[PDB]
Enzyme design. Structure first.
Site, PDB file in Angstrom:
ATOM      1  N   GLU A  44       0.501  -1.018   0.132  1.00 35.89           N
ATOM      2  CA  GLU A  44      -0.028  -0.001   0.007  1.00 35.89           C
ATOM      3  C   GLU A  44       0.772   1.574  -0.149  1.00 35.89           C
ATOM      4  O   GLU A  44       0.664   2.131   0.762  1.00 35.89           O
ATOM      5  CB  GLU A  44      -0.488   0.424   0.984  1.00 35.89           C
ATOM      6  CG  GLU A  44      -2.342  -1.308   0.748  1.00 35.89           C
ATOM      7  CD  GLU A  44      -3.121  -1.464   2.208  1.00 35.89           C
ATOM      8  OE1 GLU A  44      -4.450  -1.599   1.646  1.00 35.89           O
ATOM      9  OE2 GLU A  44      -2.780  -0.810   3.436  1.00 35.89           O
ATOM     10  N   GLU A  80      -8.689   4.885  -1.011  1.00 33.16           N
ATOM     11  CA  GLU A  80      -9.334   5.118   0.884  1.00 33.16           C
ATOM     12  C   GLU A  80      -7.434   5.658   0.912  1.00 33.16           C
ATOM     13  O   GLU A  80      -7.565   6.296   1.705  1.00 33.16           O
ATOM     14  CB  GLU A  80      -8.754   3.645   1.181  1.00 33.16           C
ATOM     15  CG  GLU A  80      -8.017   2.722   1.415  1.00 33.16           C
ATOM     16  CD  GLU A  80      -7.429   1.134   2.053  1.00 33.16           C
ATOM     17  OE1 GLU A  80      -6.226   0.537   2.013  1.00 33.16           O
ATOM     18  OE2 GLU A  80      -7.923   1.104   3.117  1.00 33.16           O
ATOM     19  N   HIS A  88     -19.131  -9.216   3.167  1.00 32.85           N
ATOM     20  CA  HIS A  88     -17.801  -8.090   3.992  1.00 32.85           C
ATOM     21  C   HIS A  88     -17.246  -9.312   4.888  1.00 32.85           C
ATOM     22  O   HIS A  88     -17.987  -9.473   6.296  1.00 32.85           O
ATOM     23  CB  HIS A  88     -17.986  -6.604   4.743  1.00 32.85           C
ATOM     24  CG  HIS A  88     -16.571  -5.947   4.411  1.00 32.85           C
ATOM     25  ND1 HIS A  88     -16.013  -5.202   5.681  1.00 32.85           N
ATOM     26  CD2 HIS A  88     -15.052  -6.212   3.903  1.00 32.85           C
ATOM     27  CE1 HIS A  88     -14.626  -4.915   5.734  1.00 32.85           C
ATOM     28  NE2 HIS A  88     -14.383  -5.703   4.669  1.00 32.85           N
ATOM     29  N   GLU A  92      -5.364  -6.742   1.248  1.00 35.24           N
ATOM     30  CA  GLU A  92      -4.846  -7.339   1.800  1.00 35.24           C
ATOM     31  C   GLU A  92      -3.858  -8.595   1.279  1.00 35.24           C
ATOM     32  O   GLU A  92      -3.258  -8.955   2.344  1.00 35.24           O
ATOM     33  CB  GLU A  92      -4.786  -6.789   2.943  1.00 35.24           C
ATOM     34  CG  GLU A  92      -4.496  -5.389   3.596  1.00 35.24           C
ATOM     35  CD  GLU A  92      -6.655  -4.808   3.269  1.00 35.24           C
ATOM     36  OE1 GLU A  92      -7.035  -3.912   2.753  1.00 35.24           O
ATOM     37  OE2 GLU A  92      -7.352  -5.975   3.988  1.00 35.24           O
TER      38      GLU A  92
HETATM   39  O1  LIG Z   1     -12.765  -3.778   6.182  1.00 34.10           O
HETATM   40  C1  LIG Z   1     -11.801  -2.223   6.380  1.00 34.10           C
HETATM   41  C2  LIG Z   1     -10.768  -1.703   5.480  1.00 34.10           C
HETATM   42  O2  LIG Z   1      -9.972  -2.258   5.064  1.00 34.10           O
HETATM   43  C3  LIG Z   1      -8.563  -2.267   4.298  1.00 34.10           C
HETATM   44  O3  LIG Z   1      -8.106  -0.720   4.080  1.00 34.10           O
HETATM   45  C4  LIG Z   1     -10.275  -1.819   3.477  1.00 34.10           C
HETATM   46  O4  LIG Z   1      -9.032  -1.975   1.558  1.00 34.10           O
HETATM   47  C5  LIG Z   1     -10.937  -1.051   3.132  1.00 34.10           C
HETATM   48  O5  LIG Z   1     -11.734  -1.053   2.054  1.00 34.10           O
HETATM   49  C6  LIG Z   1     -12.044  -1.386   4.200  1.00 34.10           C
HETATM   50  O6  LIG Z   1     -12.890  -0.321   4.487  1.00 34.10           O
HETATM   51 CA   LIG Z   2      -6.665  -1.444   2.847  1.00 30.39          CA
END
Ligand SMILES: OC[C@H]1O[C@H](O)[C@H](O)[C@@H](O)[C@@H]1O
Ligand SMILES: [Ca+2]
Ligand SMILES: OC[C@H]1O[C@H](O)[C@H](O)[C@@H](O)[C@@H]1O
Ligand SMILES: [Ca+2]
Lengths: 682, 678
Positions: free
Chosen positions: B152, B487, B392, B463
């Site tokens: 990242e 993000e 999710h 990740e």
């Molecule tokens: O799951 C919590 C967060 O984790 C990571 O940084 C992801 O890339 C993001 O999209 C997500 O909202």
């Molecule tokens: Ca991430």
């Protein structure tokens, strides 16, 4: 500050040193058993830790006395009777709370630490537990080397001051997986005998969400200190408040029999979490097993390949090595033998693809726990067994590949249910993967627990070889009907020193505290295919069905050997595996044990004696029989010239009518013993 | 000994040094692209290893030329055309066998190692792979720091010789670097004489992720694999083989972006029936939490939570929670109104109170909703509007915990009509000492994808290890993040460099699509962070960051405010029968047109880096002799990623295949164009 057993024989004093270190002390019939002993923890990345600077914020006392009925056990009912002192501590500067809870029974002491929900201790890591057991002097101990990965050692009998010098010899090498830690490190349950004749046991109860405790001896001052098992990262417990340690146990008596009789360890575990338990069944079994262990047969199907790859190797086209134990025809022979002789089940090892690479390769995808070899008809065999009122016992060797087992576990347990298997023998031979993990860390202990709980959801019983040694969790999960988790009969086939002749006179004072062992007794042929010599007599082997308590009892030898000594075999056929009462008649650790047990739901008794290195005549008190009744006793004994080394098959059988007033005298050989059945006259 | 591409532009010479070291060389149009480069392995607990003392025991050549149809992709049909040389080596003393298999395509080289079944090499452990890529000179590179746990990072553009000096700055929950001159793959380079060179790998299966370590004295890269929790770099069992190592090369940067070599070196689809796999345009309850407006957590009452003990039904709602029934329904309504397929929801399930920073094992159960999330009602409401929720599954690094819950979690998905999951691996992999990209953890990502395929579930894994073309084999892997995404535009610090999205296609996208989450219209977000882009940039990303899974990441309010611009996001397709890269220069600009699958419609995007620029393009990809309505969504002349992010123009014009377009793109800007037949 002060706590007593309900009978007043034990006094436990809790105090704080000037510097706030919490200390306890334990007194039995006016004699010190535990001298001033410190309590607490060294935490990782914490300057202050939880070693001192405490003040007592509150104490609470209470009393409990109830009985509970085990599903399976040595007695029909167990009394749980203690006085409790709960000390609430608070550390200066940090204001962290730790509770030390003590329970004092007529059998001795249990204590644990508890961390309530609080503001200033949430997530934390235990670097070392700092729990002491200061001894009154240079006791005799019955001990095995401290190890993170195996308990499969012969015991040593020595003084505390001699452990250091013996350690190099006692720490026998070339186990699949073993890791020592200290020149004076020992495992628990640890048994000791003081100069003045106290029997002292140090152990733990309810080992859940926590690392297995070993002990490290300071052999200058005779102080043991908790030495927990490191995980793969070197840590000794990843904790989150609210949470608590297992209990630490000090079981004590001036009568060695009371150590064996104690239910303290189980009493400190939570009541059964299994509501309906009639599916849980004490089992007597045979199996396709010793053939491979003793060098006659293989677990593997083929020798054609340097290694195998499941899903790539085509076993249906591989050349059979013709040595495979788990063939349809061989399994049928054991089923027939079991059904003929009143046995409940037949273990089969080597049934499934993968055995070619089972040992020493540190292989992840080693088994799938579902695919039979081409020569093992899973459907046919389970139908044939059920039609003869027999079950197969499932075998799930993992070869240390824990993730691989977790990922197959639901399909494997479902296969069990599909074919009418209701018990599994699991194993963990080899280093735990990935390398650097240990067998008895918090992390791996979690896996064994998870396997047990998931099995319970399927109504499956579990018997886990190479798992962490038990600590009474069967009360909570009675589907845990066994572990090995110590040196079993299999070592009698592994050459080297096999098992010391007095081995089975130590295991009950050590390994059996916490739960039964799948010892696999009943060897009648002691000079086995691979040249190893079993160090026992036939009558010793019969006695084990009583003296090594277990709801899971193997007759480990081959059918043809039992046929050859059919008269002796009668005792194995007759003996029960579950009991409404048990009476230890004699016991001295490392020397002898004699015990009688009343078969559950009957008026029948079974007695055994096992005897160590020194041949001995025992005088058997038959007062445990019911008064006013006559019994037919059949005595299976060593011949006068029997011997574990050079005359192992020499036994006598005789019948005599006795009452509760009858006295019996019987010679036991070196590594020998005797077995007795008692049935009321009609 | 010698191999050529089908077109004759590449020559690969394989030889052995005097001492038996295997070496390869690669030549493109008579120019060295890989100088003499060593091959082999250092094995653990092995004095000799597999470095030298080989002799060639056999060689074998063949050719292959077939086409295959992707389930989803940039084109309807992909040609796999190569010449192969298989060199069978045998080591003196040990007699061990190692095959080096080379495939030479018109786009460049793939090679791997294979170990056949043999008697003197069965179980072994790789201590280091010793695969080299010797460069012809001090190329320009577009690179991120070598790391076992995160990708990242912002890219840096520099000479090979300057990487060392920049490394402190470029290395700015879980990260572990390894060398002052270690970089990740896919690594993009440009030589001083104008060759575009990419180093990467393909079919990363049952093996540790490859990084590269640069010897900056002789300009030689060397495979540096990712250690596992015990320090090892591959627990191997013959017969076995490495992933492919790739050298994609062209004198035209656009050919790098067009190349399918990565996918061509993966096994054909193992999923037989593929119609359940559905490219997806989505919105979600997401940006709210990432940009500091809402929480994933439901309550702040407790110092920590223990699932099954903490009673969430009686906890005080913090009322900051994003994933409420009411809020989720707003996004569902917005999606159904606007023709989106789906809505992601994060924070739906118990455990978020402790998700980060605690190295917590039992962190989630992947099944229990918070009290303010009506799972049954929301999925019925979505389905009645012809929308689906996206599941999710943040794991917070507790991999065993996810594996234990995974069957029940995938069943819950199936029960409520979720067919896609976004997974996450934020934090140190447990137990501590494990890495994100080891052979061991890579196994887990693969296991999650193969298991998802058994359930007919699509996976998008944040990740996870960066992709290597495995989607050809398992096309239910419809995305990863596995790079610095949108993000980071909300996390302060340097956010994303304006030219970031002009580098990702030359690096990260080689191997598989990214869930970049484009479409931000409000660049000054609730926590004060400034998104470094213009609106027109954001629209172009639906075309310039290729993915079958495309988010419109902003809030419904913000799209409503700029409804005219939003039209592009609503119109644009997500799957394609053809793609034509019109202009591309790494770190500067990318312009590409794609033909929406099943239609005669095209969509074009340009993204532009630090330097404002006029783009001059020929519309000759359109079908000859037809007229199209074009709508051009572009930056205003004074638009700017730093100070004037919402200045855009919309213009309509009729065009044909003979039309030319000239269009200004701002700094961190871009433009987007729809083309519909008359
Ligand atoms: O799951 C919590 C967060 O984790 C990571 O940084 C992801 O890339 C993001 O999209 C997500 O909202
Ligand atoms: Ca991430
Ligand atoms: O699983 C293969 C073998 O592994 C272990 O040594 C077990 O204790 C033994 O009883 C079993 O046969
Ligand atoms: Ca064993």
């Amino acid at each position: 500050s002060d706590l007593k057993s309900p009978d007043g024989n034990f006094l436990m004093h809790f105090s704080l040193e000037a510097d706030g270190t919490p200390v306890y002390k334990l007194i039995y019939k006016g004699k010190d058993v535990i001298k001033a002993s410190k309590l607490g923890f060294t935490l990782k990345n914490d300057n202050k830790s939880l070693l001192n600077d405490f003040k007592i914020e509150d104490t609470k006392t209470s009393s409990f006395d109830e009985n509970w009925k085990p599903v399976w056990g040595e007695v029909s009912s167990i009394r749980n009777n203690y006085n409790e002192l709960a000390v609430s501590l608070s550390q200066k500067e940090t204001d962290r709370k730790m509770i030390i809870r003590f329970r004092l029974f007529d059998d001795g002491l249990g204590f644990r630490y508890e961390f309530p929900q609080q503001n200033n201790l949430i997530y934390f890591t235990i670097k070392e537990e700092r729990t002491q057991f200061a001894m009154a002097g240079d006791h005799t101990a019955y001990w095995i080397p401290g190890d993170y990965d195996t308990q499969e050692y012969n015991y040593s009998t020595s003084k505390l001051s001699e452990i250091r010098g013996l350690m190099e010899k006692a720490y026998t090498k070339g186990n699949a997986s073993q890791t020592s830690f200290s020149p004076t490190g020992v495992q628990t349950s640890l048994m000791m005998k003081s100069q003045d004749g106290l029997y002292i046991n140090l152990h733990e109860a309810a080992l859940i969400n926590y690392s297995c405790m070993h002990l490290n001896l300071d052999d200058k001052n005779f102080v043991f200190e908790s030495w927990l098992t490191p995980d793969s990262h070197g840590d000794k417990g990843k904790m989150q408040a609210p949470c608590k340690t297992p209990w630490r146990t000090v079981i004590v008596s001036d009568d060695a029999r009371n150590i064996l009789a104690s239910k303290l360890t189980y009493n400190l575990n939570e009541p059964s979490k299994i509501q309906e338990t009639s599916w849980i069944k004490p089992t007597k079994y045979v199996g396709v097993w010793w053939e491979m262990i003793s060098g006659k047969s293989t677990w593997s199907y083929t020798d054609e390949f340097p290694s195998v790859q499941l899903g790539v190797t085509d076993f249906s086209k591989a050349k059979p090595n013709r040595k495979h134990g788990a063939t349809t025809a061989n399994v049928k022979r054991y089923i027939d033998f079991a059904a003929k002789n009143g046995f409940d089940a037949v273990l089969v090892e080597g049934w499934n693809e993968g055995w070619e690479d089972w040992i020493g390769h540190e292989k992840d995808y080693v088994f799938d726990f579902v695919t039979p070899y081409p020569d093992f008809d899973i459907k046919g065999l389970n139908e044939y067994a059920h039609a003869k009122k027999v079950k197969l016992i499932m075998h799930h060797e993992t070869s240390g590949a824990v993730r691989n087992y977790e990922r197959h576990m639901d399909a494997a347990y479902k296969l069990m249910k599909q074919y009418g298997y209701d018990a599994v023998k699991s194993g963990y031979v080899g280093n735990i993967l990935p390398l650097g993990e240990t067998h008895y860390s918090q992390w791996t202990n979690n896996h064994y627990q998870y396997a047990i709980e998931k099995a319970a959801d399927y109504q499956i019983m579990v018997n886990a070889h190479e798992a962490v040694r038990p600590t009474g969790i069967a009360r909570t999960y009675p589907n845990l009907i066994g572990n090995e988790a110590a040196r079993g009969t299999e070592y009698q086939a592994f050459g080297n020193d096999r098992n010391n002749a007095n081995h089975v006179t130590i295991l009950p004072f050590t390994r059996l505290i916490g739960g039964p062992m799948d010892y696999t007794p009943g060897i009648f042929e002691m000079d086995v295919t691979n040249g190893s010599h079993v160090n026992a007599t036939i009558a010793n082997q019969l006695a084990l069905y009583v003296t090594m308590y277990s709801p899971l009892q193997m007759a480990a030898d081959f059918p043809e050997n039992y046929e050859r000594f059919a008269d002796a075999f009668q005792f194995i056929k007759d003996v029960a595996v579950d009991w409404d009462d048990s009476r230890y008649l004699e016991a001295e650790p490392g020397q002898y044990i004699t015990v009688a047990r009343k078969a559950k739901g009957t008026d029948n008794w079974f007695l055994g004696n096992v005897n160590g290195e020194t041949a001995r005549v025992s005088n058997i008190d038959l007062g445990f029989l019911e008064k006013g009744k006559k019994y037919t006793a059949v005595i299976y004994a060593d011949a006068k010239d029997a011997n574990y080394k050079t005359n192992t098959q020499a036994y006598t059988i005789r019948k005599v009518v006795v009452t509760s007033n009858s006295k019996l005298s019987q010679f036991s050989a070196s590594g020998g013993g005797y077995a007795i059945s008692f049935y009321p006259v009609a």
